[PDB]
């Protein structure tokens, strides 16, 4: 199966100004025909994937002159001269020469801002859920950007991670910052075997852990 | 153009589903009809294609055991069978064209395996646990724990608290969805002011109110 690369996972950008997105494939993607199998799909928040450029660079009707794909053989290019609002949201990119057809990671346009800390909060099981039989411990890290943060759960100084729910919210609307949810979930004996709870984040916003805790007692 | 995809499915585990593609605007037997998934969050999966003249198929051989292409040209429909569907099936299917002749997608049909009844969800106050508070503002929260089907609406003081607020997207995790929502005020708001997360679940006909109380 032909792996597709694409790069960045995540592209930050400015209304108004260009963007570029990468698409490297593991084989040659030039077919015996002469044609590279290659094209570009944008898909708009909660909308269905829509192709925007076929055989590497040849535009689909009513596409925007602002969109230029370009390269050969295994690496390829998809440009932006000038990012608009409506430009926002999941590019793939997906090759037709190797069977099967093997679609790229996906690309996500997120508006660019300054660096934002976040705000961790860290909270106990509470009472009702104990009485249930189950213990889920719940950390919030929120406004923060950019996205990219690595978060662990630290039980008494080791960490942990068994029974682990996260969740992220898309970019704010208002903002530009990201917000993160994770729920570590033990069962109220597990719960009542340790006794400090923290909720560790590694961020681009400091160079020490940002933590948040709470003893059992 | 158009393809005019099924309604969402909900899926017994290892039982099966048979989901419908629609065409109108062209030829149904002139090109091949795709069929796509793309499961929670992640990337897009070619399941393999049928051609309605000949009803001829080509698998991805990755589904090969869990896909059947099927067309009915009377009523230019297409139709991809899905067999002992699990919890990995679980997500967004398409039907699509991309040829020569154009580049048509269909809405998509979500299919949600689950073996699941309706289940309202178990909704946790999250307190602060009596840990500082040397912080201006105070981050309160509510666990809205295995509910099923999605989705369900959470609201503060009932539309009072708007701003500051942080519900986050439901993740389905062992048959059931989970989700948590957050809401910051000041330290002279709370606990002085109460506080209390509304959850409303339309599928149980439930709505249920859950006051935080400081932590005792
Ligand atoms: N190897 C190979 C191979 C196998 C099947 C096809 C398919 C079709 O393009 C695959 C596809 C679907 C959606 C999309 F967004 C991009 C591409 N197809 C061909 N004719 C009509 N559909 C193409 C190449």
């Known amino acids: 199966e032909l792996v597709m690369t694409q790069s960045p996972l995540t592209l930050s950008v400015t209304i108004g100004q260009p963007a570029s997105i990468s698409c490297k494939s593991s084989q040659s993607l030039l077919y015996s025909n002469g044609k590279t199998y290659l094209n570009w799909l944008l898909q708009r928040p909660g909308q269905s994937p829509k192709r925007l450029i076929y055989?590497?660079?040849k535009l689909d009707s009513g596409d925007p002159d602002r969109f230029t794909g370009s390269g050969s053989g295994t690496d390829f290019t998809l440009k932006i001269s000038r990012v608009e609002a409506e430009d926002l949201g999941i590019y793939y990119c997906?090759?037709?020469?190797?069977?099967?057809?093997?679609f790229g990671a996906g690309t996500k346009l997120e508006l660019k801002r300054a660096d934002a800390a976040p705000t961790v909060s860290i909270f106990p099981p509470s009472s009702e859920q104990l009485t249930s039989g189950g213990a889920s411990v719940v950390c919030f890290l929120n406004n923060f950007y950019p996205k990219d943060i690595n978060v662990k759960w630290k039980i008494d100084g080791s960490e942990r991670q068994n029974g682990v729910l996260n969740s992220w919210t898309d970019q704010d609307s208002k903002d530009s910052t990201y917000s993160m949810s994770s729920t570590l979930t033990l069962t109220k004996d597990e719960y009542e075997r340790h006794n400090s709870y923290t909720c560790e984040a590694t961020h681009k916003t400091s160079t020490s852990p940002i933590v948040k805790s709470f003893n059992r007692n | 153009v158009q393809l005019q995809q099924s309604g969402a499915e909900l899926v017994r585990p290892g039982t099966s589903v048979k989901l419908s593609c629609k065409a109108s605007?062209?030829?149904?037997?002139?090109?091949?009809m795709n069929w796509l998934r793309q499961r929670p969050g992640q990337g897009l999966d070619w399941i393999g294609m049928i051609h309605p003249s000949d009803s001829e198929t080509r698998l991805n051989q990755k589904f090969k055991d869990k896909a059947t292409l099927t067309v009915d040209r009377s009523s230019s429909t297409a139709y991809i069978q899905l067999s002992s569907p699990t919890s990995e099936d679980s997500a967004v299917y398409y039907c699509?064209?991309?040829?020569?002749?154009?580049?048509?997608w269909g809405q998509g049909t979500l299919v949600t395996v689950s073996a699941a009844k309706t289940t309202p969800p178990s909704v946790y106050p999250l307190a602060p646990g009596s840990a500082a508070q040397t912080n201006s503002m105070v981050t309160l929260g509510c666990l809205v724990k295995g509910y099923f089907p999605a989705p369900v609406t959470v609201t503060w003081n009932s539309g009072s608290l708007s701003s500051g607020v942080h519900t986050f997207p439901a993740v389905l995790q062992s048959d059931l969805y989970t989700l948590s929502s957050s809401v910051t005020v000041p330290s002279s708001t709370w606990p002085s002011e109460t506080v209390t997360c509304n959850v409303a679940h339309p599928a149980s006909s439930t709505k249920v109110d859950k006051k935080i109380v400081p932590r005792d």
């Open positions: 055989l590497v660079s």
């Open positions: 997906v090759q037709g020469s190797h069977f099967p057809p093997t």
């Open positions: 699509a064209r991309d040829d020569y002749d154009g580049a048509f």
């Open positions: 605007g062209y030829s149904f037997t002139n090109y091949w």
